[PDB]
Amino acid sequence: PMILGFWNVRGLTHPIRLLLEYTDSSYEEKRYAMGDAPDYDRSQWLNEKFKLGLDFPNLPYLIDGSRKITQSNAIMRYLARKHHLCGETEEERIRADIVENQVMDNRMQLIMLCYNPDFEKQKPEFLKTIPEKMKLYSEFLGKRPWFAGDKVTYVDFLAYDILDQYHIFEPKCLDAFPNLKDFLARFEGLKKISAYMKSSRYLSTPIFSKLAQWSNK
Amino acid sequence: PMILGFWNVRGLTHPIRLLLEYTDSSYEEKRYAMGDAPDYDRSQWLNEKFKLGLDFPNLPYLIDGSRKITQSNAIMRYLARKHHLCGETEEERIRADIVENQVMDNRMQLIMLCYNPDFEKQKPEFLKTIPEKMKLYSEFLGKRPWFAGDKVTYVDFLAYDILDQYHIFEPKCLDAFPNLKDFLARFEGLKKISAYMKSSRYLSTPIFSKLAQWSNK
Numbered sequence: 338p339m340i341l342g343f344w345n346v347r348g349l350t351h352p353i354r355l356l357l358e359y360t361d362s363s364y365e366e367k368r369y370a371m372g373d374a375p376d377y378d379r380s381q382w383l384n385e386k387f388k389l390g391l392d393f394p395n396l397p398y399l400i401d402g403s404r405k406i407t408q409s410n411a412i413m414r415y416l417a418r419k420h421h422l423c424g425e426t427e428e429e430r431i432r433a434d435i436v437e438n439q440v441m442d443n444r445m446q447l448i449m450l451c452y453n454p455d456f457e458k459q460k461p462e463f464l465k466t467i468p469e470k471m472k473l474y475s476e477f478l479g480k481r482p483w484f485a486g487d488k489v490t491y492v493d494f495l496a497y498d499i500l501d502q503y504h505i506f507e508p509k510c511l512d513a514f515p516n517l518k519d520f521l522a523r524f525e526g527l528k529k530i531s532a533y534m535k536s537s538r539y540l541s542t543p544i545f546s547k548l549a550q551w552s553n554k
Numbered sequence: 555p556m557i558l559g560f561w562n563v564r565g566l567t568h569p570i571r572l573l574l575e576y577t578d579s580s581y582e583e584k585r586y587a588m589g590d591a592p593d594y595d596r597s598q599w600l601n602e603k604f605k606l607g608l609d610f611p612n613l614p615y616l617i618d619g620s621r622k623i624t625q626s627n628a629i630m631r632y633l634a635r636k637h638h639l640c641g642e643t644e645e646e647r648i649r650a651d652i653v654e655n656q657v658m659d660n661r662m663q664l665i666m667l668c669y670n671p672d673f674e675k676q677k678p679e680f681l682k683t684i685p686e687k688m689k690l691y692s693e694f695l696g697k698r699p700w701f702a703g704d705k706v707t708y709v710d711f712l713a714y715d716i717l718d719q720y721h722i723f724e725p726k727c728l729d730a731f732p733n734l735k736d737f738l739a740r741f742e743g744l745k746k747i748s749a750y751m752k753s754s755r756y757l758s759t760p761i762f763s764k765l766a767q768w769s770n771k
C-alpha cells in the first residue's frame with residue numbers, strides 16, 4: 338500500500354486523508370508524535386527524516402512504490418492525476434489553480450495567528466477579516482455545486498477543509514453565506530466521506546501542533 | 555495587450571516577467587508605487603483593488619482579454635498551458651509540482667527573515683542554512699539540463715528566481731554546486747532572456763519594499 342506520513346494531527350493533511358478515502362486507495366499511515374512543552378521533542382520524525390529517499394524531506398510525504406512525493410499540493414495533484422479529479426477544460430483548470438493557491442494563503446493566515454504568543458490580543462482583529470474572506474469564496478462558487486464547475490475535483494477537498502477550519506474557529510462565519518453551508522453539507526454527503534467520518538481513522542482535532550495557541554491539544 | 559499588475563519591486567513576480575519575455579508576450583505592466591513612512595501608503599492599489607473584476611483581488615494579477623487571473627502560481631500555470639511549457643510525462647509533472655511548491659516555501663522563508671524584528675540577532679543562523687538548501691536543489695537536478703528533465707518548463711523560471719536571490723544574499727552559497735552554477739548561466743543564456751536583462755524593463759532589485767531590511771532600497 339501507499340504510505341502517507343504526517344504528524345498526529347489534522348494540520349494541512351486533512352485534504353489528503355479524505356482523497357485517499359474518496360478514491361478507495363490502498364494505503365497505511367504513519368502518524369508521528371511530538372512531545373509536550375517546554376521542548377517539543379521531534380525525534381520520532383528526525384530519526385528517519387533523512388532515510389526515506391525523499392528529494393526534499395518534509396511532512397507530509399507519500400510513497401506509492403518507487404514514487405516518493407512531498408509538498409501537500411503535489412501529493413494532492415498526483416492523486417487527482419491518478420484518479421482523474423482534475424479540471425477538464427481550460428476554465429476548470431484556471432478555477433482549480435486559483436482556489437488551490439487561495440486556500441493556502443487563507444490556511445497560512447490562520448496558522449500565523451494560532452502560532453503567535455500574542456494570540457489573545459491579536460484574535461479580535463483577525464476575526465474582523467473573516468466576513469470578507471468568506472464573501473470571496475461565496476461569490477466565487479456562486480450557484481455551482483463544486484468549486485471548478487459541475488464536477489467534484491481535488492480542489493473541493495482543499496476548500497472543504499479550509500472552510501471547515503474557519504467554521505470551527507468562528508461558528509457564525511458562514512451564517513451570512515448559505516451556498517457555503519450548502520457546500521459543506523454536500524461534501525460530507527458523499528458516500529466514502531460519510532463512511533470515513535465515522536471510522537476509527539477519522540482525525541478532526543487537534544488542528545495544530547502542541548506548539549499552537551489554539552486547537553493544540 | 556495583456557496587463558501584469560504588481561508593486562514596483564521584485565517580490566514574487568520575477569518568474570512572471572521572465573515568462574512573458576521568453577514567450578514573446580504582448581503585455582504592459584502597471585507598477586504600483588507604495589507611499590512611505592510612517593503609514594507606507596497603498597492608496598494607488600487600494601483605490602482600484604475591488605474595481606478590476608478580480609475574483610480574489612491580489613498582486614500580482616494577469617488580465618489577458620476576458621481571462622483575469624490572481625495567484626502567482628496560477629499565473630504561471632496559465633502561461634505554461636498557453637505556450638506549451640508543461641512537463642510531458644508523469645515523472646515530469648511530478649518533478650514540476652514538487653519544485654513549484656518547494657520554491658514558495660524557500661521563497662517565504664527568506665521573507666520571514668527580511669521583514670521581522672531582530673533580523674541581525676538572527677542574521678547568521680538562517681544564513682548557515684542556505685548551503686544545505688542548495689545541496690537539495692543540487693541533488694534534485696543532478697546532470698539534467700532542466701528541472702523536469704529534457705525541456706525548459708515554467709518551473710525553471712521559478713528555480714532560477716529562488717537560486718538567484720539566495721545567490722545575492724550568499725555570494726558563495728553556490729561555490730560547492732557546479733550544476734547550479736551551470737543552471738543559472740544557461741538560464742541567463744536563453745535568447746530572449748539575455749536581451750531582457752539588458753533592457754529598461756528589467757528589475758532585479760529591490761526584492762521587497764522600503765519597509766523590509768534586505769533588498770529594500
Ligand SMILES: N[C@@H](CCC(=O)N[C@@H](CS)C(=O)NCC(=O)O)C(=O)O
Pocket residue numbers: 348349382386394395396397407408409410655659
Ligand atoms: N509547503 C509544505 C509545508 C510543510 C510543512 O511545513 N510540514 C510541517 C508541519 S505542517 C513539518 O513539520 N514538516 C516536517 C519537517 O520540517 O521536518 C506543504 O504544503 O506540505
Ligand SMILES: N[C@@H](CCC(=O)N[C@@H](CS)C(=O)NCC(=O)O)C(=O)O
Pocket residue numbers: 438442565566603611612613614624625626627
Ligand atoms: N500567494 C500570493 C501572494 C500574494 C501577496 O502576498 N501579495 C502581496 C505582495 S507579495 C500584496 O501586497 N498583495 C496585494 C494585496 O494583498 O492587496 C501569490 O502567490 O500571488
